Write a protein that binds this ligand. Structure first.
Ligand code: NA
Length: 438
């Protein structure tokens, strides 16, 4: 009634969300690592176990994917300085980026060039391990390169994987599963991009299309998998296994910074800008980053103006009890990996205290910056992977965010701004030329 409209008036940013206006929200309740940790429900030991499991699978990956052999079967991406892009952004948008801007190239991760691959590949491998252990065919002391044998491939070919996805997660699962031996079915909305559907279908992956949203595709994926004990559902909304897979990135990045001699501390703060779809990818990475760098890393989520599911969920405190469609937002965006109308739930509650803020940007901003990055640095990405690129200027422009955290412009001169590129390596020439044309 009158109280319901009094309640809504307490959440004025929702008006801007409905109006599709680019905005930024800084979390007034962002906490220390210690204060936020209990809400995650996962520990550093859980992350260490993920690291250990990837090291067990490293001989397998080195043999199966020889491009990783020099790194010993580790799947990791470059981190590069992008100073020409930094200057271009300053020219185009008229806001100084204090400090130094870098790009984390998960767009070019080996085997499958996406942030989602960190989790997808990890989950597939974790699941294969579980099946082999419980069949009494493997122990954690065995050399996991044995799993590449025709015998083990045959064993795994008895099983299937089901997954609801916008595209990239399915691609990474399909690629790893083909090697392991699993059959795959990807459940996806009709809204998903044609080229990602075609790429799965051309590689022996079953695609089930739904005349509904991503959320329905995931739920119908769940139901289909329940019928068959040999079918395993990878749950993009709920999987802690995916989450931990992404979290591996934290210590990897710290090691890279250590190699590059790059300092992160109170006087050299690290800011990280993460594209957000359902929240699993950016949430997991953020968790790993927080464990690695503590209170000196400051994480932000970036969403399309047409799909601000996580910002809406966190800002209202409703999380997954509300969707963007609930308030008239169409969930239609060129950032197809981020076209998720309802936030994870578990990520929202687990990670909100560990996020300094969340912001939105338009498709045109993503397209413009996509072109500029190619022009300035020679790096070609998909639209979703540009969501974090708007971040450094949102932060450097906000005097009041700097007020809240005891920063200044002078202090930010010592800052590192890390834009997390989430996809681009798997994009065909025809599709990339279309993105460059806007
Ligand atoms: Na989203």
């Amino acid at each position: 009634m009158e109280n319901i409209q009094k309640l809504i008036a307490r959440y004025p940013l929702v008006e801007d969300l409905v109006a599709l206006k680019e905005t930024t929200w800084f979390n007034p309740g962002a906490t220390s690592l210690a204060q936020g940790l209990p809400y995650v429900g996962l520990t550093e030991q859980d992350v260490n176990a993920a690291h250990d499991r990837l090291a067990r699978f490293a001989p397998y990956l080195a043999k199966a994917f020889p491009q990783t052999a020099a790194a010993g079967g580790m799947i990791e991406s470059d981190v590069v300085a992008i100073p020409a892009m930094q200057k271009r952004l300053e020219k185009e948008y008229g806001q100084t980026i204090n400090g130094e801007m870098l790009l984390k190239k998960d767009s070019h991760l080996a085997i499958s060039g996406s942030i989602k691959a960190r989790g997808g590949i990890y989950e597939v491998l974790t699941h294969a391990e579980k099946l082999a252990l419980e069949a009494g065919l493997l122990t954690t002391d065995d050399d996991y390169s044995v799993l590449l044998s025709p015998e083990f491939k045959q064993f795994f070919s008895q099983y299937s994987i089901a997954v609801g996805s916008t595209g990239n997660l399915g691609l990474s699962i399909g690629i790893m599963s083909a090697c392991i031996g699993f059959k795959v079915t990807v459940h996806m909305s009709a809204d998903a991009r044609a080229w990602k559907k075609a790429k799965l279908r051309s590689h022996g992956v079953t695609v089930v299309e739904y005349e509904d949203d991503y959320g329905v595709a995931v739920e119908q994926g769940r139901k289909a998998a329940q019928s068959d004990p040999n079918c395993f559902f990878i749950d993009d909304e709920n999987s802690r296994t995916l989450f931990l897979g992404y979290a591996v990135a934290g210590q990897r990045l710290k090691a890279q910074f250590a190699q590059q001699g790059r300092v992160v501390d109170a006087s050299h703060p690290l800011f990280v800008y993460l594209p957000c779809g359902v929240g699993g990818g950016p949430g997991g990475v953020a968790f790993g980053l927080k464990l690695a760098f503590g209170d000196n890393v400051h994480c932000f989520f970036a969403e399309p103006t047409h799909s601000p599911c996580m910002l809406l969920g966190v800002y209202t405190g409703l999380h997954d009890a509300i969707s963007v469609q609930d308030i008239g937002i169409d969930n239609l965006t060129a950032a197809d990996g981020l076209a998720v109308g309802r936030a994870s739930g578990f990520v929202g509650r687990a990670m909100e205290r560990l996020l300094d803020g969340l912001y939105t940007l338009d498709d045109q901003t993503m397209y413009d910056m996509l072109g500029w990055l190619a022009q300035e640095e020679g790096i070609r990405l998909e639209p979703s992977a540009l969501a974090g690129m708007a971040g450094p200027q949102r932060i450097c422009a906000s005097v009041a965010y700097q007020q809240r955290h005891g920063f200044s412009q002078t202090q930010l001169g010592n800052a590192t701004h890390l834009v997390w590129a989430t996809g681009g390596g798997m994009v065909p020439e025809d599709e990339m030329e279309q993105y460059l044309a806007k």
